[PDB]
Structure formats: structure tokens, C-alpha cells
Design a protein around this ligand. Structure first.
Ligand SMILES: Cc1cn([C@H]2C[C@H](O)[C@@H](COP(=O)(O)OP(=O)(O)OP(=O)(O)O)O2)c(=O)[nH]c1=O
Ligand SMILES: Nc1nc2c(ncn2[C@H]2C[C@H](O)[C@@H](COP(=O)(O)OP(=O)(O)O)O2)c(=O)[nH]1
Ligand SMILES: Nc1nc2c(ncn2[C@H]2C[C@H](O)[C@@H](COP(=O)(O)OP(=O)(O)O)O2)c(=O)[nH]1
Ligand SMILES: [Mg+2]
Ligand SMILES: [Mg+2]
Ligand SMILES: [Mn+2]
Ligand SMILES: [Mn+2]
Ligand SMILES: [Mn+2]
Ligand SMILES: [Mn+2]
Lengths: 683, 289, 289, 683
């Protein structure tokens, strides 16, 4: 048993009726002094280390050649000038086991935390020494954390893509289905999660060019995609993860849901394919009034109207579809479908729930397209256009497939540094750089949408950690007040930075002129409502920091009208799974699942108290399962009103909660404006 | 939470010796060396002798002390498989490969063998020590049973699987694979019954039961190493058999809800080739807030 | 001279209730009067209790005390059938025909029914009185087991057979006929083992054993009469069932090698109507032609 | 019960100790006059019929527009002048259930046998009235039978392709694997059977861009292809059929074979994918000497030598691969592998066995490529070049994927009419037309190879029927003498027709000048050895029909050298499954399985005596299971020496014979020059 593992295990040994939280500092110190400093390759000078890394196929010479070695040396000086110390053993362990650069035999350590941060900053700045130093200060202060792909792979020769979330539209054709399988395998090969919209595919028992009842439906494509993701398993390193989305009004919705039942047949069940259900307001209205609903065969609708069923507004088109004799449908019970959804989420956590009209009532790019589905993590909500992949000899009609770049603000560190504006703008610049430098050669729609939309996702994390370390309960109205003010400021400065980038480059995103940013409809609630804190305690948290006012929002609206907006999408709160340990932060804006995290690595068990947990703030670190999910919905809806994309919203349920309770949580989330629901986690 | 599921898996795995024709094994048996034939005979007798204890005592004694009608039924089914199916299958394999006099001599030898006897009597001793209404003594016997089902058989199973993976003695190897598949589920099931008892105990009592299980495993493991060298050195396989024992010891521990004891090792590829919370309806007013 | 043929017969009779689809009885069940459904549920519940104890206790305990691996294999197989197949089949029938509350109520009814408790007390008492190496206590338990197999089940079997013979509840009836086919061979087999022990005794001891058997039969019989009246008076069949149980009492005595005790009577004719390629290695000469 | 199937069941009622074979004539007469004439749509004149069929999307207008209606009327008169009568109930039943055109609701019958034959003939002739009449005479006499795709779809609007056998080479890349899946689904959608070569794919545990043990092997691609073929099943009426081929020296050969074991797990076993094994002479030599063979990792060989393993000569490079340290190899026992092959064929009929050096020692186009795999029916043996499908933005290097049009001569009717030359030439013309009118616009390599190679397959059937109806035992030397003479004559006239077509069109097949036809080496055994019948009984069978001598073959060799050949491949003997009933012929050149064949169609049981079966030739119709497989191998090898492609050779095994007997049959087939072995059928 390692000495640091023993020291970390002494946290649970209760001395004087309290956990020994101070043992984790001893644990991390022992971990470093006994393992990391021993296994860290040291070089006489930074020049020798850099030469070894570039020449041994560890780094990329292209981005490092943009600086004189003096500038790189000063950047590394800035990283090491902070004397950053990992507060807990788990932070250092997670970094040096997941993100630190190791030798080709994975025996020694080439990169410390400062080296990784310096390389990421030098890649972000793209030749600017002052910008690189600013990125170094931002990341070594741990105010901004680039996503796991960006943080892990930036500046590495043998790297995967810096983007890991992709959203593909699948057209109703064998050519398009085969192309979707190919692109899914190519993107999973790069290490990215792939989400596929299956709503355009015609249901089971539909006609294929005069041969009726010949289509296997969305479940055959589901099996194809599941095997494609199983094959493209990231070189046998990490299991290939993909998601499939289907509209709740699709005829195959029940077959779609039956793929996740525990009793599912092996010719129906899918293993590596997550499922998400898209629910328009029409379905919730039908279930509310207990009227019997209809699911429609998409190809009949396409033949009758020339438009896909998911391309049309179900609120206005549902009655026309039902009254159309040439549109084929079967009766369903919407309440029974809702209960089936809740039962499936209780049993397996699936499907994801995307409230279509909650997303699109505040969507800023409805002119480009409505948001029809989400990503594998249920936070990316962007307009997509389906591609028409024709025969081999013909020319394909390339659409827009969603792929956004992820980054997370550390709410605790941004708040303690009083640097919401600077951190938000620098994170926007880094995400923009990642977007520009991303070129995917086997997903033409993804590449086209990356070049045109220039969408980024700037998330946040350590919300519960910041609140509990400041004596604020997560469910308290003061917590929602802080979330309101903080994310209003984040949105303000992200919009300002996007407009500044548009002014600097003289270009906006494609089809910006039709957006609500161009017409000013986006800024209505910001030029009409004041989002300053309503509590003196919360207003004191923002001391020394200018909270944007209504006049500031009017000035921003005028600036955006004059100069445009560079990013179609800017903010999305991803789960931030493994980077939260490195940042000593609670995951995303979700509340903590456990106060102290018990995990086993190898044959030794490890203990991870939540960051900042102590005796004084023990009960402010309320576990998510002990919380009222209605108040968590209230918090996420408070945040969601300032996030243009969605938020990964996990439901934390007790074992005593019934199907009716899960349905009530889902319906209250729909009522409160929640766009997506990620997971149903039961204790 | 588990007995009806195991009931289903057990009964759907039902099989009979007569289903596999054995005579075609003589076409590969005749080509083995004396040491190979000797090791095979000795291994087979070892498995036979241990499985008889499980049929006559191990399963019936556990069925007797476990409470619950459905558990008693599953346990009865497992005891039936030992006595009615497995025992007849081992006898059939023997009668096919050796003449009567050779069978009697091999069983005389294995009956006197120090390493086979040590493990057989250690297991039987724990079954004999179960006391009425004492769940601690029952747990100890369940641990012994899991160790037999999921661990002790495998120094023996190695050889038939080794031949089976090479295309030799395929009929008897198929039989052994069916037997092994039954013992695997027996070990998992009895393991769950042991964990149920373990979870009803205090923290101090749990630590004491863990020490018991590890101590017992150690005694059996050290004897398995000697048993292994005694049988497999003459055919040069002992190193690989030892890896297989440790791998199966880890499975046995996991069946008892314990951590693996031994580091992960790769196994001989030839042997590898051989091997609802509560539904409640929405009653309206849940759509209004 | 007989165990091997009983072994073969028992294993060839192996079945599971799931082999029989029961939804076909749904309508003929729906059509029965409330009195008829009540008697039917209770009858099968009484059978379930008997098989529960025969599987949990009776067959395993007799297996423990009878010498010989083949005799033990037959008895173990019979034990498995009792609780893993027979007792469970009744739940398959209940779950098809009846709502959960009616099922719950009938199992509560077995616990409080005085005749069913008395017969269980008497039979299980004799099973638990068996003393190791004491052949007389074993004989007494085997007599009790034959009386359970060949006599006591029949107050229950009457009603499913009575319906089967009229073309009603024929899927449930098919299950019951399979159960009855098993019990008939179980009663014969245990009867032969009992006769073995009886035949070892002095004439004086034999005379006492006959007294035991006849006294026990009469005591069980008198209780069964009251049980029969309690169940069948509401459907008008008590006298008919009584004739049937006397008929089967004589069969139980005969299974024990004793003369019939009750006079012959005409039984309801409805109830009578209710009754791989071989692997050969390649040679060197196979590659030249 | 239907009257016709009641009459057909009176065959088995033995009257006076004999089967009532004449009942089948009464059975078919009743079938017609009680079902067919009643359910046949009859029009006032042929003009109304043709107008009705063209207008209602039953026929194609383009091919019928090349003839004036007087010419079409003359063709239909020629078809009906023969007054063809089906000799058995099964012939007419199979035709009117599988190939006869029916109304859109599958209610009535639009086409008779004469109508279908006339339409196929007018399609073949392509505007020529006399050629259409010649085709009508050829098919109404049943001398030549177009394959099921051609006969079923010739001249129909809503039709599949006229080719159903496709062979695909898969390169060792994810782009090529995705393209293989796409092309397999596209061709299965067209109704064709697709065979794929998986030998170029690197084995399990190979590196994917310097990360080791990353490749899932050929079994992952096998699962992908199996699900692709399950998806593209054409309503499931005829589920997607695929074949995978692996060289026996591939490292994944054991896992490739384990996909067909009965005890295979659901994560390994493939169900809709047939498997074939390509065995070079090196493997047979290694097994013969009982030496230690080695299977190789294809990627190591490709990295070391720059060529794929299956593109290299194993008989000359096996020792170099073994001695090369940079090539990764695994030790195997070749005799154990042979025994495993025999056991797998006994238990499942798989794999197909291709003797690679038997194919390539007589292959005429080794300059283009060696034959590396066969088709799903294990008789197409043509040169293929793998394609290089690149990224979306890059151009693809299109190779040559095999596909040939099938057509069978009826040996009995051809020999009765003494029309080997005319039938062979007309069938060659029809197959050439089918090749020219085929355009696969989603399989680029199939299209390119169809345009370049112009390969056709002209098979034969009713060999056993002809021999049994002429008092010749299938195993007798006289039968092999007849097969030798007949198929030498077929080869002579097919080569003559190919040379005449090349002379008329002024073009040969691509890379003809490097072929053995151009060098004249192909004709060596024909200009040196006389193939006239050696038995007086056989010589009388060819009386009235000129048998080409050595002088005739020398003249043909000069003609080919001076004019070239139009088809790279001309002759392949396919199984000819269902068209054998319509033609009242035994299936292919294989011996019959049952003298009287009992089948159940729906809830009706009907019996099919072999064509011409009686008491005078009962014992000449010896069942395939009762005869020596060595003599059947001798017969197939006698036929194979005149066939440029392979012959679908099914092995008929009794239950008594062991795996050693199957291995002996395989080794004798390899010794006797058998190119492929199709199935191990056991009774
Ligand atoms: C991407 C991928 C490839 N493979 C296998 C299948 C292909 O035959 C083989 C080649 O993959 P490639 O697509 O050629 O990968 P690569 O070009 O980046 O690697 P290399 O430089 O070695 O050519 O790898 C997998 O098994 N799983 C996978 O996820
Ligand atoms: N010497 C050295 N410095 C390293 C290494 N990895 C990162 N660094 C950082 C530490 C300093 O901030 C910076 C410059 O180190 P140096 O080259 O030793 O500089 P100097 O102090 O000699 O001027 O590089 C490393 O491996 N060696
Ligand atoms: N009348 C008619 N003839 C058909 C039909 N299908 C095929 N035929 C064939 C039969 C003849 O050989 C040929 C000409 O038939 P027709 O048009 O009736 O001409 P004719 O009999 O007046 O010369 O067409 C059909 O449906 N009707
Ligand atoms: Mg289409
Ligand atoms: Mg490649
Ligand atoms: Mn056993
Ligand atoms: Mn067991
Ligand atoms: Mn019973
Ligand atoms: Mn019984």
C-alpha cells in the first residue's frame, strides 16, 4: 500500500468526532514527493526538454515555431511563478493519470501541470507572447479549464481531435444512412461522441419505392450504428460512445424506447448507443388533457407536404397531420408514453429528454433551422441542416452538422479573482482558436458547420463548491440569485467578446442577419429586466466587479447591431466529468452526489472529499439525492435563461421515488423552461 | 432480488450425459503419451471425488440450513445436477477411456493422494461444522462451497480444457465444459447467499469473516500449488496451471463480494480457446403547477 | 434390481410448467361458479403445501439416510421435482387464473386450515424423527412418504381430473396429469425401499410395523375425510372424492406390500376419463493419391 | 385440397410396385386448367396487353420501342408456335410462383411462359427482330436459360439488377471498410449476393497509427458486414446474403472460422454471412509434410514489403515472411487447421474452400491480378484489383470488383437439338448484352470492372439428367468422357464467339494483350490434346454435330491472336437453384440429391420426381449421397479443365463418414485440380 494511499485513507478515520480532512494535503504531498518527482523526467534546461519533446514525436513543431525560445521560456516562467499546488491527492492523481504527457511506454512523466498549461496556452495564443502569458495566468489560477480533448491534446503530435461532441443529421435514404455510419465511425475514431438524429428516417413497415412494408425503421439503423460504434472503439482505448435521437411523434418511438429495456431481445437491444427523446409542447399538451395522441409515419408526411415531419412545427401541423388521410398514423396514449419514459429512466437512466419548444422558443437561429436534437451529453442545442448524400458519381448536398468546442469557467476561482469579464473573454478567444484550428476531413457537414457557424460552448463548473464554501445552500433562493447574476454577466461578456471578434475580423457567422441578435429580439429581456442580485449577501459576493445593467445591455445591443456577432452559439454547460478533479471543483452546475467520494483505483481504494469540504460547511455540501429536484430544476432554469445552448441536467432520484415522481420532475422541468434532461440517477 | 433469475438460468441449462456420444474420443486418446493419459486420469478422478462430496453433502447441507422456499428449490436443483448428471457424466468418461481395472487403481491412488485428501477433507470439515440456527457457521460452509465450485475444480478443469482447445478429446471436453458451466453458476449463487449473511453482520464481525475467508483461501491455495506440481510437472504445464488457479481464486472472491487477492495475469490461449422502482400512473394535476 | 430403471424413467419424465401455455384455460375458468373456483384454488394450495414439504424436507432427508449413490441420485431427482417443478407449477396456474389478492388469501388460508396443518405436522414430524443408522425410524418416514405420494395428494387431484374429464381447464389439467404421473412412480419407488427394511425384520417386528402403517393410515384418513368435506360440500362432490381417496389408499398400501384395506367402489367415470461428425485425425497417407 | 396437388401426390402411391410418374402430367394439366388459365389476364390482342403492361409500370418502354409492333407480334407468334408444355407440375408451379409477372396486388397472372420468354428475347436482341426470334427459339426449346435475375427482371420497370453475384476487395483502412459496408448494402438492396475479400485487412492486435493491439481484426468487420446484410434484406423476402473470404495464412483465420461454430457467442457469431477460406498450395504442402505452419499479420507484411500479403505469392514468399524478423507471425498446426475446416464443414457446411493455386495455375488473366477469392456461390473466379477509397475531399482510386452475368445451357436439350455451337454463341451474345446494359451507379469498382473486363458466366445444367436419361452412370468413365467432349466444345464455341464479338466491335477486354489468350499459352492443351470422345457410346451422342479437332483449335488460336477476345472470362457453372425446376433439369452439373424430391409449400405437400425419372432409368438416377465423392471430384475436375472460372461444387456426405473422409475428399479435389468447393451437405 502506497504511503499517499494510506494517508488519503486516514480521512475516513474519525479523530475527535471529525474526518481528518487535513490528511489529503499530506496525501498529495506524499504522492508528489514519493512518486511524481521520482517519475518526472527532468532536463538541464527547458530548451533540451522542448527539443526532446518535438524530436521524439511528442509535440507539434508548427505551433512552437511561432515563438522565439525566449518567449516560450517566459511563458513557462509565468506558469511556474504561481507555484501551483494541488490541494487534494485526487486532483494530482487524476491529472498525472489522465492528462500528463507520458513516455511512449507510459513509464515516466514528461509534463507537469505547469508544462501542460504552458503548452496549452502557447497553442491558444498562436504566436502572441502576451496572450500566451494571459492564458497561462488564466489556467494556472484555474479560472478557466479547457475541455478534456483540448486540455489533453493541444500541442501534441499524436493527438485526437480537440472536439469530442458531434451531432449528425441522418436523411431518409440508404446513401445517407451509410454515410452516417461512415462519419460516425470516423468521428468515434477521433475519440468524439457522436449524436445522430433518426427522426427523418421512415418508420418500420414503410414503402421503399413502391414496395410497401419494407423498411426496418429506426431500429435497424440503431443496430447498424451500435455495431459501428462498437467497431470504432478509439483504437481499443475507450469504448465508442454514440447517441441516437428520435422525436416523440415518430412512429417508431415505442420501438426506439424498447431498445433500452432490460428484457429487450438481442436483435432489438443496443448496448453502446444512448437514446434521447425529443418532446414538442404538443405532446405535453396532449398528455396533460389525456387526449389520445398519434405517432406519424415520417415518409407519408414527407410525400404529402414535401417536408420532413421533424422539419415542421408540430404545434401547428399536428391537427393537419391527423386530419390528412394520406398521412399514416397510429393512436397512442401520451400519458402511457410518459409513464414508459419515466419507467425507462428509473430502470436505466435513458432516454435523454429534450423539450423541443423550450429550446426553440429562445433559440437565436431559428431562421437557419430549429433545434431538433441534442448531443451525447444533452447540452448542445444548435440549428442543423440535413445533408443529401447522393450516389457515388453525383455531387452531395452538404448541410450543417453540429460540433462545438467546450470550455468551463471555474465559478469559485473566477469569483474569488473578480475576473468574470476577463476570464469569459479569454475563454471565448481560446474556444474561437480551437474552432478555427479544427478541420475534420471525413465529416463534410461537420466541417462546413464549424467553418460557417463558428459555434463554441463556454460552460461553468464549481457552482455547488462555490456556494457551499460561501455558506449558501444550493436550493436556497440566494443560490439562484447568484446563478442569475453570474450567468447574466457571463452571457454579457461572451456576447461582447463575440461582437468584438466580429468587429476585429469584419465577419459574423453565416446567416447571422436573420438571427435574433441581428434584430435585437435576443436582448429584449436584458434591456427590460435588471439581473442584479436581489440579496445583500449575493450583492456582496460581486463586490469590486461591475454587474452589467440595463443601460450596459442596451449598449451591447447597439454594438451587436453595428458590428454583428461572431459565434452563433457561445455557452453550453457540459458535465465536465474528469477535469473537475484536476480543477478541485464540483462537476458542472450540478449539486454534488456525495460529500466524500469513495473510489477504487487498481487494487487500492481512494477517498475524495468534495473541494472545500470541512466541518463548518459540511451541511452546505448537501448531497444531490437528499435535495428537492424541484429546487434543482429551479436553479437550472435560472441558469438556462442566460445560456444560449442547453445544460447537462442530471436527475438525482431516491430509490423510494416512483414513476409518478420522475414524471412530475420532468413536467416541472418542462414548465420551468428546462431545455434538456440528461440522466436519471437513482440512489 | 436474485433467486427467481437463478432458477431460470439453472433450469434452462439442464442437460443429460447421453446427449454427448463419447466413443469418438478413442481416436485421439490412443495418440497421447503415458504421462498425458496418467495426468488426465488423475485429474478426472480428482474432479469426480470432489464433486461427489458436493452432491452428497455440500449442496444438500446448505439447502437444509437456508431459509426460503424458492432458495431451497434452486439448491435442490443444483444438488440434483451434482448427483444425477455430473456424477454419471464423470463415470461415463472414465468407462469410455479406461478398462475397469485401470479405473479402480486410479481411484485407489487418488483416494490415498495427500494433496487431494487435504483439500477434500478441509471442505468437508466446514460442511460438518454447520450448526442449526447459526448463520456464522453457515457462512463459513458457503465460503468453502464457493471455493470448491469457483476455484478448487479449476486445477483439474485445466487439462480437459487444454485438450479441448487443441482438438483432442472433444466429446469428453464438451461434457466437462457443460459441467464447468454449471459449477460457475453454482458458485455465483452460493456466493450471493453468503454475501446476504455477511451483510447482516457488524463491522467487527465482517472483518473477522474476511480474515476467515482469506486465511482459508491461503491454506487451499498453498495446497493447490503442491497438487499442481504433483500432477502437471510430468507434462510441463504447471506454470500456466498456476496462473489459471489464481485467476479463478479471484473469481471466487468476487462471488463472495470480496476484492481480488492476486494480480491480473493472462491465461494460456489454448485453454482460453477451450473455455424497477415503482410504476405509478399520472393522476392529473401533475401537469399543473 | 430396480434403481437404474427408476433413474432412467425419472430423468426421461423431466418437464417444466412453462412447456404448457395456460392462457387457453382463461375462459373455462371465468365460467365456473364462485364455489367451484374457491374449491379449485384451495385444492391446489393444499397440493402446493404437500409438495413444498416433500421437496424441502421429505425427499432430501430420505436421500440422506438411504445408502448407495444411485439410490441417492434417484431420491435427489425426485426431491428437485417436488419443489422446483411441482410446487412451482401451481403458482403458474394461480398467476394465470387468479388476481394477486385471491392468491395471497389462499396462501393465508393454508396457514390457518386445521386439517392441512394437522397432516403436515404428522408427515413432517415423522421425517424429522429419522435417526441415523436406525432403519425403523426410516421405515416409518417412508410409510409417511408413500401415504403422501399415493394417498394424500388425491383429495386434491380429484378436482383438476374431474374438470379435465369434462373438457374443462385442460391446460392446468395437463400439468396436473404430469405431476400425477411423477407421484405414481415416486410412491412405487419409496414403497420398494420401505419393503426392503420391513423384510429384514422378525415376524413380531413386522406385525408391529403393519400396526404402525394401518394406525397411521386410519389417522390420516379420518383427517382427510374432514378436509374433503370442508372443501367439497360447497360443490356437491364430497362423497365422490371420499370414494376416490379410499381407492388410492389401497394403492398406497399395495406400494408398501400390504393387502387393500377398503372395499372397492365405483369411481366417477368423468375422473377416469381425466386420467457433430466424428473427428478422425489425418494420416500421412491421406495426402497422397 | 387442390386437385392438381392431389394428383401430384398420386405419384408416391405405388401401383403394381411402381411409382405413378404419369400423374405429374395429369397434375400439371389440372394445375393449368384449374388455376392458371383462370387466374391469367387475357387481352383481346397483344397490342392491348403490351399497352396495358407499359402504361401500368410493368414493362420498360425503351426496349419495346426498338421494334415495330409487327415485329413484336412475330416474336410472340414464334414463342407460341412451339406450343410449349411443362412436363411436370413443379416446373409450371415454380415458374408461375417465382418468375411469371403478376398484377400489383399479386392477384392475377399477366405473363405466361411464352410471354416472359418473348420479353426476355426482345430485351436481348436490342432492336433485331431475327435475333429476337432466335432467342425465342433458344429459350422456348429450353436450350439456354438466363439466370434468375435476368429471366425475372428482363424488360420489367420496377426491377432489380440483372446481375446478382458481386465480389468486393476491401482495403486495410477505415474509409475502405466504410465504403465496403456501403457498397454491400447498395448491392444487397439491388438483390445481389455480395462476396468480400477480408485478407488485406490487418489481423486482431495490430497497430492503428503506432498504437498497438488496437485493431479488432477481421471479425469486427465481419460483424459490421453481417449487420449491413441484415439491414439490406429487401423486405426480408430474400434476406441479404453475404460471403466473406479469408486467406488461410491470415492470422485471424481461427477467429474467422470460429464465427461459424455452433458454440459461438453472440458477440462473435455471424449468421447472414457465409465464409470462404482461400488455401494456397503452400498450406497443403505444409500440412502434407506435418511441418509447423505460420499465419501472418497482414499489416506487418505490408509495412515490410509494400504489398499486401494476398497480393504476393505465398509459395515463394512464405519462407521470406517466416525468416523476416519485422514480419509478425503466429505458429499454427496446418493439419489441425485442416481438421478444424473439416469439422466446421461437417457441422455447418462452412467454409467454402478455394484452392488458390488450382485457380491461378490455369487463370488466363494473372497479369491483371491473381484470383484471391470466390463469390457467394463459390464459382466466380476472376482477377480483382483493390480500390483505395480516400477521405471525402480526396479522389478515390477505383479498382476492379468482380461481377458476371449468369446463364445456363440445358445439356439435355442442347444435345437433343445438336446445337452446341448455336446455343453457346447466342447465350454468349445475350450475356454480353446483359453485361453492356448493366450500370451499377453506387459500386464504382463493380461498374469499372464490368465496363473493362466484360466478364460473363455461361454455365450448364441437366448433366446428370442427360446422363441418366441416356443410360450413363454419373460416376462412370463414359460420363466423364461426355463431359470432357461437351465442355471442350462449349469452351471452343464460347472462345469463338468472344473473338467474333471482339472482331465486330473492334475492341477487346482491358489488358487483353497480357492474357494467355493473346500469348497463345491458353490453347496449348487444345492444340496438343484431342478431346474427341474415347467411347463409342459417347461418340454416337455427338453424331451429327462437329467436334473441333486439334486443327480447329489451332485455327481458333490464330483467330484469337489476330482478333483478340471480348470477354476476360466466359464460362462459370453456377448452382442454378430455382431455374432448374422451370427448365425441368437437374441442378447444375452436380448429381441429384433425391430421385423424388418432397417439398412443402405453405400447408400443401408436393413431390417432384427428377426430370425423366422412370423405371427404365431409376438406378441411373443415383442419389449424390450414395455415390463416391472421389468420382464426383473426377467428374468436376474433368469439367473444370474447360471452364475458365470455377464450378459450384457441393460435397454430398453421409452421416457415417468422419472428418477424415471430408478432409480426404478436399485433398483429392485439390490434387485433381478442383478450384473451389462449395458446400458440405450431409444427409
Ligand atoms: C479506425 C479503426 C481502424 N481499425 C482497423 C481497420 C483497418 O483495417 C485498419 C486501418 O485503419 P486506418 O483507417 O487505415 O487507420 P490509419 O490510417 O490512421 O492507421 P494506419 O496508419 O496504420 O494505416 O485499422 C479498427 O480495427 N478499429 C478502428 O476503430
Ligand atoms: N530546467 C528545466 N526547466 C523546466 C523543465 N520543464 C519545465 N521547465 C520550466 C522551469 C522554468 O520556469 C523554465 C525555464 O527553465 P530553465 O531552462 O532551467 O531556465 P533558467 O532558470 O536556467 O533560465 O522552464 C525541465 O525539465 N527542466
Ligand atoms: N390476343 C392475345 N394474344 C396474346 C396475349 N399474350 C400473348 N399473346 C400472343 C398470342 C399470339 O402468339 C400473339 C398475337 O396475338 P393477337 O394479338 O391476339 O393476334 P392474332 O391472333 O389476331 O394474330 O400474341 C394476350 O393476352 N392476348
Ligand atoms: Mg429516397
Ligand atoms: Mg490507413
Ligand atoms: Mn458437479
Ligand atoms: Mn456444483
Ligand atoms: Mn410432487
Ligand atoms: Mn412425489
Amino acid at each position: 500500500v502506497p504511503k499517499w494511499i494510506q494517508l488519503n485513507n486516514e480521512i475516513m478515520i474519525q479523530k475527535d468526532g471529525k474526518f481528518q480532512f487535513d490528511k489529503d494535503k499530506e496525501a498529495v504531498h506524499s504522492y508528489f514527493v514519493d512518486y511524481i518527482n521520482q517519475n518526472t523526467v527532468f532536463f538541464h534546461n527547458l530548451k533540451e526538454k522542448l527539443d526532446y519533446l518535438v524530436e521524439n514525436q511528442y509535440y507539434e513543431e508548427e505551433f512552437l515555431s511561432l515563438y522565439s525560445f525566449e518567449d516560450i521560456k517566459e511563458v513557462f516562467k509565468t506558469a511556474y511563478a504561481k507555484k501551483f499546488r494541488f490541494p487534494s491527492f485526487m486532483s494530482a492523481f487524476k491529472f498525472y493519470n489522465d492528462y500528463a504527457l507520458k513516455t511512449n511506454d507510459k513509464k515516466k512523466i514528461l509534463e507537469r501541470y505547469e508544462d501542460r498549461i504552458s503548452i496549452v496556452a502557447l497553442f491558444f495564443a498562436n504566436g502572441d507572447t502576451e496572450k500566451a502569458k494571459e492564458y497561462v495566468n488564466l489556467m494556472i489560477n484555474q479560472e478557466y479549464q479547457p475541455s478534456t480533448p483540448t486540455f489533453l491534446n493541444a500541442g501534441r503530435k499524436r493527438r485526437g481531435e480537440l472536439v469530442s461532441c458531434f451531432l449528425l443529421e441522418v436523411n431518409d435514404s440508404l446513401n445517407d444512412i451509410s454515410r452516417a455510419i461512415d462519419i460516425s465511425m470516423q468521428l468515434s475514431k477521433l475519440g468524439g461522441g457522436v449524436s445522430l438524429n433518426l427522426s427523418k428516417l421512415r418508420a418500420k413497415g414503410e414503402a421503399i419505392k413502391d414496395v410497401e412494408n419494407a423498411t426496418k425503421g429506426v431500429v435497424g439503423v440503431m443496430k447498424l450504428l451500435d455495431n459501428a460504434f462498437r467497431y470504432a472503439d478509439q483504437m481499443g482505448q475507450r469504448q465508442g460512445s454514440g447517441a441516437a435521437y428520435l422525436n416523440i411523434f415518430h412512429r417508431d418511438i415505442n420501438d426506439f424506447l424498447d431498445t433500452k429495456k432490460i428484457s429487450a431481445d438481442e436483435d432489438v437491444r443496443v448496448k453502446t448507443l444512448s437514446i434521447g427523446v425529443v418532446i414538442p409542447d404538443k405532446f405535453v399538451e396532449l398528455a396533460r388533457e389525456d387526449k389520445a395522441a398519434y405517432v406519424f409515419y415520417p415518409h407519408t408526411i414527407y410525400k404529402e407536404y414535401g417536408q420532413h415531419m421533424d422539419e415542421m412545427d408540430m404545434n401547428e401541423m399536428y391537427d393537419k397531420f391527423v386530419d390528412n388521410p394520406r398521412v399514416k398514423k397510429e393512436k397512442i396514449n401520451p400519458r402511457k408514453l410518459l409513464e414508459k419514459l419515466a419507467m425507462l429512466r428509473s430502470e436505466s437512466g435513458y432516454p435523454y429528454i429534450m423539450f423541443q419548444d423550450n429550446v426553440n422558443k429562445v433559440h437565436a437561429n431559428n431562421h437557419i433551422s430549429k433545434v431538433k436534437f441534442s448531443n451525447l451529453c444533452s447540452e448542445v442545442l444548435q440549428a442543423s441542416q440535413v445533408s443529401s448524400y447522393t450516389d457515388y458519381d453525383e455531387e452531395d448536398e452538404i448541410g450543417l452538422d453540429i460540433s462545438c468546442n467546450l470550455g468551463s469557467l471555474n465559478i469559485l476561482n473566477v469569483m474569488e479573482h473578480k475576473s468574470i469579464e476577463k476570464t469569459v473573454k479569454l475563454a471565448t478567444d481560446s474556444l474561437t482558436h480551437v474552432s478555427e484550428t479544427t478541420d475534420i476531413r471525413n465529416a463534410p457537414a461537420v466541417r462546413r458547420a464549424n467553418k460557417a457557424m463558428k459555434s463554441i460552448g463556454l460552460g461553468a463548473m464549481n457552482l455547488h463548491g462555490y456556494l457551499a464554501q460561501n455558506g449558501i445552500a444550493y436550493e436556497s433562493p440566494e443560490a439562484r440569485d447568484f446563478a442569475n447574476t453570474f450567468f447574466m454577466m457571463v452571457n454579457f461578456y461572451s456576447i461582447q467578446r463575440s461582437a468584438e471578434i466580429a468587429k476585429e475580423k469584419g465577419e459574423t457567422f453565416d446567416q447571422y442577419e436573420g438571427s435574433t441578435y441581428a434584430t435585437g429580439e435576443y436582448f429584449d429581456k436584458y434591456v427590460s429586466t435588471d439581473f442584479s442580485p436581489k440579496y445583500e449577501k449575493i450583492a456582496n459576493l460581486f463586490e469590486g466587479m461591475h454587474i452589467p445593467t440595463t443601460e450596459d445591455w442596451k449598449k451591447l445591443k447597439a454594438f451587436v447591431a453595428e458590428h454583428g456577432m461572431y459565434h452563433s452559439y457561445r455557452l453550453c454547460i457540459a458535465p465536465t466529468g474528469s477535469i473537475s478533479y484536476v480543477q478541485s471543483s464540483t462537476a458542472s452546475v450540478m449539486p454534488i452526489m456525495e460529500r466524500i467520494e469513495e473510489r477504487t483505483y487498481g487494487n487500492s481504494k481512494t477517498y475524495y472529499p468534495m473541494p472545500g469540504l470541512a466541518s463548518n460547511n459540511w451541511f452546505f455540501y448537501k448531497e444531490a439525492y437528499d435535495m428537492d429536484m424541484f429546487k434543482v430544476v429551479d436553479m437550472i432554469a435560472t441558469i438556462q435563461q442566460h445560456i444560449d445552448q442547453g445544460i447537462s441536467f442530471t436527475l438525482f432520484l431516491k430509490d423510494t421515488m416512483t414513476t409518478r415522481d420522475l414524471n412530475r420532475i420532468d413536467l416541472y422541468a418542462h414548465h420551468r423552461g428546462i431545455k434538456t434532461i440528461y440522466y436519471a440517477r437513482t440512489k | 432480488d436474485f433467486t427467481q433469475m437463478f432458477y431460470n438460468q439453472n433450469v434452462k441449462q439442464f442437460w443429460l450425459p447421453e446427449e454427448i456420444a463419447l466413443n469418438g474420443d478413442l481416436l485421439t486418446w490412443k495418440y497421447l503419451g503415458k504421462n498425458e493419459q496418467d495426468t488426465y486420469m488423475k485429474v478426472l478422478a480428482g474432479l469426480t471425488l470432489l464433486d461427489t462430496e458436493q452432491g452428497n453433502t455440500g449442496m444438500p447441507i446448505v439447502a437444509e440450513h437456508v431459509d426460503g422456499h424458492q432458495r431451497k428449490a434452486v439448491l435442490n436443483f443444483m444438488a440434483m445436477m451434482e448427483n444425477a448428471v455430473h456424477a454419471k457424466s464423470y463415470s461415463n468418461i472414465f468407462m469410455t477411456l479406461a478398462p475397469t481395472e485401470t479405473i479402480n487403481e486410479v481411484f485407489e491412488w487418488v483416494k490415498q493422494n495427500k494433496y487431494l485428501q487435504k483439500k477434500a477433507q478441509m471442505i468437508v470439515g466446514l460442511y460438518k461444522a454447520i450448526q442449526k440456527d447459526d448463520e456464522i457457521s453457515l457462512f463459513k460452509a458457503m465460503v468453502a462451497s464457493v471455493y470448491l465450485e469457483s476455484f478448487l475444480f479449476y486445477s483439474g478443469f485445466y487439462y480437459p480444457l487444454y485438450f479441448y482447445g487443441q482438438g483432442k478429446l472433444m466429446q469428453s471436453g464438451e461434457i466437462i465444459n457443460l459441467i464447468l458451466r454449471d459449477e460457475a453458476i453454482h458458485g455465483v449463487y452460493v456466493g450471493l447467499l453468503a454475501q446476504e449473511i455477511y451483510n447482516k453482520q457488524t463491522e467487527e464481525k465482517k472483518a473477522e469473516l474476511r480474515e476467515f475467508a482469506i486465511d482459508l483461501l491461503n491454506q487451499l491455495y498453498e495446497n493447490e500449488l503442491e497438487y499442481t506440481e504433483d500432477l502437471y510437472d510430468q507434462v510441463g504445464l504447471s506454470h500456466d496451471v498456476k496462473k489459471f488457479i489464481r485467476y479463478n481464486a479471484n473469481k471466487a472472491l468476487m462471488n463472495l463480494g470480496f476484492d481480488p487477492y492476486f494480480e491480473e495475469e493472462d491465461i494460456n490461449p489454448i485453454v482460453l480457446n477451450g473455455l424497477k422502482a415503482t410504476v405509478e400512473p399520472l393522476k392529473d394535476d401533475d401537469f399543473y403547477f
